[PDB]
Symmetry: D2
Subunit: 275 residues, 4 copies
């Protein structure tokens, strides 16, 4: 019942974590609050030059007094089961996801949880609010090759393209005498993606008739989780190419998102190719 504790890009990550700490205890003026917490704590790290936020139309240039080498694209507050999303890399904020040096998300649940990766796999952390610090609870998290959960808003079935319609059909009526997958959809991305990571399976927000480029945002929603998910041995596709290979044409560009267990995503891609 007794324990011991053991401990510029590093600088940046500690500040993002501190903002996540702050955001956590504060959990729509809340959107505003959490937004400025990130902006300001990020701008005190002396390691940023350009920030991209889901809450600001244009990129936020760090004054040279406090300027450093990294670029941070974030969604300060996404969605209980609310989240924060970020990736570290105005032209400097339009890099494809493959240039990501670091990224992660926090999920504000019964406990505040952080998935983090700097290119050598994914680590899961838990905010110890008493200590005011993040505790490692799992190293190098790896996703199942194949799961049994599919996760999308089926209320858009009327707007689905053929591939999505087909893939969902295969999940409910496997033509191979196997059990249908279970369905789960919280409707908060961080929460659905995090379940997908630890339990396995697939999460989709594809293009549909009413959102032809999907809903979720490339720079600070899709690219970050795609990075996390791939570092855990999964896949993240738009349906036509890996999310991390999209070349951003605007900082609030949307893309389709399909990610998860690699064999599930590969099954989806098969449905797309064969139309």
């Amino acid at each position: 019942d007794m324990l011991t504790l053991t401990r510029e890009l590093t600088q940046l990550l500690n500040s993002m974590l501190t903002a996540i700490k702050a955001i956590s205890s504060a959990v729509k003026k809340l959107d505003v609050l959490s937004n400025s917490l990130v902006i300001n704590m990020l701008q005190s790290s002396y390691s940023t030059c350009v920030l991209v936020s889901e809450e600001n139309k244009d990129a936020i240039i760090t004054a040279k007094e406090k300027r450093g080498k990294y670029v941070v694209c974030f969604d300060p507050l996404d969605g209980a089961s609310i989240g924060t999303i970020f990736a570290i890399y105005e032209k400097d904020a339009l890099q494809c996801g493959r240039n990501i040096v670091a990224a992660g998300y926090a999920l504000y649940g019964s406990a505040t949880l952080v998935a983090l990766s700097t290119g050598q796999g994914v680590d899961l952390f838990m905010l110890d609010p008493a200590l005011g610090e993040f505790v490692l609870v799992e190293k190098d998290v790896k996703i199942k090759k194949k799961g049994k959960i599919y996760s999308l808003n089926e209320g858009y079935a009327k707007y689905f393209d053929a591939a999505t319609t087909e893939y969902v059909q295969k999940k409910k009526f496997p033509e191979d005498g196997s059990a249908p997958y279970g369905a789960r959809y919280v409707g908060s991305m961080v929460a659905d993606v995090h379940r997908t990571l630890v339990y396995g399976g697939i999460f989709l927000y594809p293009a549909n008739q009413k959102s032809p480029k999907g809903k979720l945002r490339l720079l600070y929603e899709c690219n970050p989780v795609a990075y996390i998910i791939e570092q855990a041995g999964g896949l993240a596709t738009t349906g036509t190419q890996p999310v991390l290979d999209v070349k951003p044409e605007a900082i609030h560009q949307r893309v389709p998102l399909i990610l998860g267990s690699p064999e599930d995503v590969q099954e989806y891609l098969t449905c797309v190719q064969k139309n």
Copy 2:
């Protein structure tokens, strides 16, 4: 930035709340732990004679030393977004839901939340862990007449009966030029029911081919939430009769559960009648 605090069946409810407090900070040996916490704190209130638990095969008779007039059926730990469910009333534990004097649930999220009702509407509470007490955050909660969210596991589509198949079809393809409903399904009952209460709409765990009597348990899952939901102006049906009117034929009896906004549930019932 300053506040003032203001304050036998009552006895029973404080003990259930205390167990919920304990359960909350402890959040599969966890199932065992939470179970005994309820049993023992309930048996110290000197107000129970018969307990029914999701974790115990048979009813748990209170010794006469500590015996009182009420009967408690509970699910100590259901399912982040885990919950606890209870209703207050061995033959003494097989009453139909209409004899309920009190019931509620807790949802262990970013905050621990309790929906409670003693027959005069529903009150929402928040556990103040610092104070170690529950704070009123909303009185007489009322559900929307009609919502725009439907919530069920569609991975069972292959096992759905005709009415369910039909109703889900109507939600995606409204034949009235209205928008399709949105879908949400966390897969934890307390979490799905609680969303249904505050946002409106409908939650279904109907009978299907593989679970012909549904999955959820009458005494300490379905009856409790049916009570909460009706006290908030909603409906809770098995498809053929109000949940609270089922006459229990066994303490772990299952029933179908459809509940929520009354006009949504009434639409469902229409689909059942007309088959």
Copy 3:
């Protein structure tokens, strides 16, 4: 086991309280940290023009962008049993204590406690960290007419003046067949003063040979607690005049402090007069 919560100078006090909240969870770079927390949260209230801090040589003038009518003298971190002290009123910071509109202290113990007064008695509050707000636990706190505790550093006995020597002698060897007083001295002012308020008795940091003007600071140590203590029905003297009547001749001026139950302080004054 259930509760309800009920709710420009007001603005200023909420910000001081917020800084006390922040200081509380952060509890010598700590001195620096707590200092800036007060300064900055006070300067965001748009209600200050001049701040005086124990940590800054000179007064801190609020820019006109954020300027308001009140002056705040504070000790951000005094001294477990650490505290924060403040009074609300550069010439504008050299007012005698009688111009005080509001003052108080926080004591960071097992719980964070605030004694507060705006001229109509003293109220005691407890920081509810979960709620992030201060809860009233006692209104109009009144001190005993006479106590049985005396509190000073007797390790300075060799430096005491005659009156102090005499008074301490009378406490140990009452010449009236009454019990000697008990002694208590934590060595943190907020902690010793707070005990004096709730239990009664007397607290002394008189002049001595090595500190001829006493040790404690008039503007943000002595004046504040003198205000609190008098609003609770006590006295606060330098030995020659009420603390709140001293005319400040410098912002870090020291004065002797004797305060507490009025009959105890009056006994002390008798010892001074008769030398």
Copy 4:
């Protein structure tokens, strides 16, 4: 900003710690509450046969169902700055302190702190309430050879024996041109002893005219802290022999307590010998 955690007598200590956890968040029916928390958690460890409590007249024999090899003498709640004290070893509870296998105290401050020793020095712990576990913050704590603080209730000066009178005189008026010691006396033993450990110096509750055997209790006040203090390189005497060498003649026997920096206690003993 990220951390990793690393982990029958052992059994007993974890349960004592758990009770300290419980006691901590509950911080005179409080005396009663904390008492039963210790008794019951100690009796669930299956490692005790005889308990001695400050709150129970007679020793508390563990039923054989749950009987083990160790004996625990404790003060569940002593005295903010409240504490809990215990030593591990009815005849089985009257052993001299030298048979102690383990002992410690908790101090319930701004943080809950535990000093612990099992014969190989003293370790300091901090309760991490979030983790619900105790974190090591300092290993093998060692006390100063000599301090500059003396700590006793001088309101008993009229009842002091000659040695105490003399020693206190030497502290205020050093006959060697050295500074007088500072005085500190919180009046809660755990708090005064803990300050003595980390800052150095001496703490006294000697015999006086009105308490000829001192006030503090041998089995669960004096023996425990004497053990802690000696394991940190200090001394603990009654004035005539080491506390840990007293042979208990009753389970609520009192003894004088003088402890702290060894050279300070040795100075005191000199004053006793030479009368």
